[PDB]
Amino acid sequence: MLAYQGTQIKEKRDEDAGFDLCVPYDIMIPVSDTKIIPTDVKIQVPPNSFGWVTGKSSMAKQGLLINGGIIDEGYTGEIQVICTNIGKSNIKLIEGQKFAQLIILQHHSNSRQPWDEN
Amino acid sequence: MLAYQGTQIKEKRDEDAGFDLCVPYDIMIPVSDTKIIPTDVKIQVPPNSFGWVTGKSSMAKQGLLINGGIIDEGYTGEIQVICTNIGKSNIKLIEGQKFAQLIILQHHSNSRQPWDEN
Amino acid sequence: MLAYQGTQIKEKRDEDAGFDLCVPYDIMIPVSDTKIIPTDVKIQVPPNSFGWVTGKSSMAKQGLLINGGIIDEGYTGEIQVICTNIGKSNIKLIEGQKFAQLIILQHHSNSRQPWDEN
Numbered sequence: 001m002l003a004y005q006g007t008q009i010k011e012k013r014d015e016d017a018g019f020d021l022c023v024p025y026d027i028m029i030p031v032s033d034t035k036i037i038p039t040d041v042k043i044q045v046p047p048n049s050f051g052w053v054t055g056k057s058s059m060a061k062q063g064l065l066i067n068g069g070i071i072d073e074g075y076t077g078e079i080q081v082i083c084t085n086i087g088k089s090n091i092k093l094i095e096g097q098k099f100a101q102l103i104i105l106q107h108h109s110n111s112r113q114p115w116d117e118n
Numbered sequence: 119m120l121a122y123q124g125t126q127i128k129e130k131r132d133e134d135a136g137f138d139l140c141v142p143y144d145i146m147i148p149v150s151d152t153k154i155i156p157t158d159v160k161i162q163v164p165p166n167s168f169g170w171v172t173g174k175s176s177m178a179k180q181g182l183l184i185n186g187g188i189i190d191e192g193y194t195g196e197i198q199v200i201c202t203n204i205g206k207s208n209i210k211l212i213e214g215q216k217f218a219q220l221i222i223l224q225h226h227s228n229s230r231q232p233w234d235e236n
Numbered sequence: 237m238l239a240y241q242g243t244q245i246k247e248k249r250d251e252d253a254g255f256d257l258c259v260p261y262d263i264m265i266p267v268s269d270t271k272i273i274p275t276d277v278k279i280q281v282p283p284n285s286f287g288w289v290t291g292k293s294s295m296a297k298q299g300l301l302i303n304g305g306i307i308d309e310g311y312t313g314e315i316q317v318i319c320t321n322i323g324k325s326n327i328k329l330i331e332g333q334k335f336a337q338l339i340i341l342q343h344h345s346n347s348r349q350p351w352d353e354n
């Protein structure tokens with residue numbers, strides 16, 4: 001479950017894990033560079049959930065790597081996508097195209113317990 | 119829960135998170151290249167679940183990076199493993215060896231809610 | 237839920253997905269190198285759970301990549317963090333600073349089912 005706003009996120013099919021995120025403008029990412037691509041997307045998830053921004057098969061096969069990608073439940077800004085080209089060729093993203101996906105997960109990172117020495 | 123077929127996936131121990139995926143043939147991956155390694159593995163997961171193909175500690179320590187890796191519930195093909203060498207040395211994979219693992223997760227990417235302006 | 241020990245893990249806020257892991261000593265990571273950074277952190281998670289060591293936004297934006305990162309339920313050692321610099325500049329980590337985060341997830345990688353030919 002989640003709420004979201006923005007024009008750079010597209011409605012998904014039920015059988016896909018994630019929503020596609022769409023590139024805002026044409027941009028070239030030279031070999032070995034890192035670019036921070038802005039989106040207008042903002043999400044609200046339920047307690048103990050988080051958003052995970054990760055790669056698509058079509059851009060991963062060209063060497064685009066999405067790094068970072070953990071969207072905490074308390075974040076109220078716009079998602080930024082951190083992209084590094086680890087391929088051997090310049091990558092050109094075209095306005096509009098899918099270039100990452102957002103998956104919503106639940107974590108259990110809470111309720112610390114006593115260590116069992118057993 | 120899942121169903122699977124193929125000879126390149128190995129049965130796992132209960133206390134490990136993922137199934138090992140096995141390299142189909144000897145292959146060298148030069149510094150900075152990307153190779154798409156085919157498996158014969160096919161999986162069926164329950165609704166709102168997905169498979170996650172990600173790295174092993176022994177190959178990550180040599181600079182092998184598994185990229186992409188999100189196996190949607192609707193996919194009915196064979197898993198492909200997208201590998202990039204981000205290390206400083208050529209990597210040689212040997213026929214049979216483990217080189218990635220498949221973990222089954224549930225996502226909550228569905229049931230869009232109204233935004234709370236609160 | 238989890239138990240943990242060690243001085244290189246910090247208590248978290250409820251609204252963040254993961255615990256920060258803290259660098260043990262000053263260390264420089266040259267462009268394209270890979271370093272294995274030791275922690276003293278040990279965790280115990282419940283059955284069918286795993287720990288996921290992954291990146292922070294502030295270090296991902298400089299080109300630090302955390303690779304591997306899957307901490308199995310049966311592991312009883314100290315977490316090691318595998319770091320590769322995929323940026324274009326040398327990265328300097330300072331003693332004490334956050335440089336990765338640990339998120340606790342549940343997997344469903346178990347209870348193999350019959351394939352449905354339907």
Ligand SMILES: O=c1ccn([C@H]2C[C@H](O)[C@@H](COP(=O)(O)OP(=O)(O)O)O2)c(=O)[nH]1
Pocket residue numbers: 053067068069070071072073074075078079080081082291292293294295
């Ligand atoms: O790829 C990413 C990773 C993080 N964030 C946002 C959401 C996340 O909750 C916030 C974390 O920022 P921080 O707490 O200031 O940084 P750090 O992760 O370095 O602790 O940044 C993004 O938009 N994109």
Ligand SMILES: O=c1ccn([C@H]2C[C@H](O)[C@@H](COP(=O)(O)OP(=O)(O)O)O2)c(=O)[nH]1
Pocket residue numbers: 055056057058059171185186187188189190191192193196197198199200
């Ligand atoms: O590392 C990967 C990533 C994806 N896939 C398969 C499963 C996934 O469901 C499908 C997605 O292909 P697509 O929808 O055509 O591409 P995209 O992810 O670029 O939208 O590719 C793999 O086999 N290996």
Ligand SMILES: O=c1ccn([C@H]2C[C@H](O)[C@@H](COP(=O)(O)OP(=O)(O)O)O2)c(=O)[nH]1
Pocket residue numbers: 173174175176177289303304305306307308309310311314315316317318
């Ligand atoms: O980034 C990582 C990845 C793994 N591990 C630890 C926990 C994990 O359970 C164990 C796996 O070691 P292995 O079974 O010997 O290696 P492999 O993953 O190559 O099968 O290594 C770490 O400390 N850091």
Ligand SMILES: [Sr+2]
Pocket residue numbers: 016
């Ligand atoms: Sr798709």
Ligand SMILES: [Sr+2]
Pocket residue numbers: 134
């Ligand atoms: Sr193992």
Ligand SMILES: [Sr+2]
Pocket residue numbers: 252
């Ligand atoms: Sr933070």
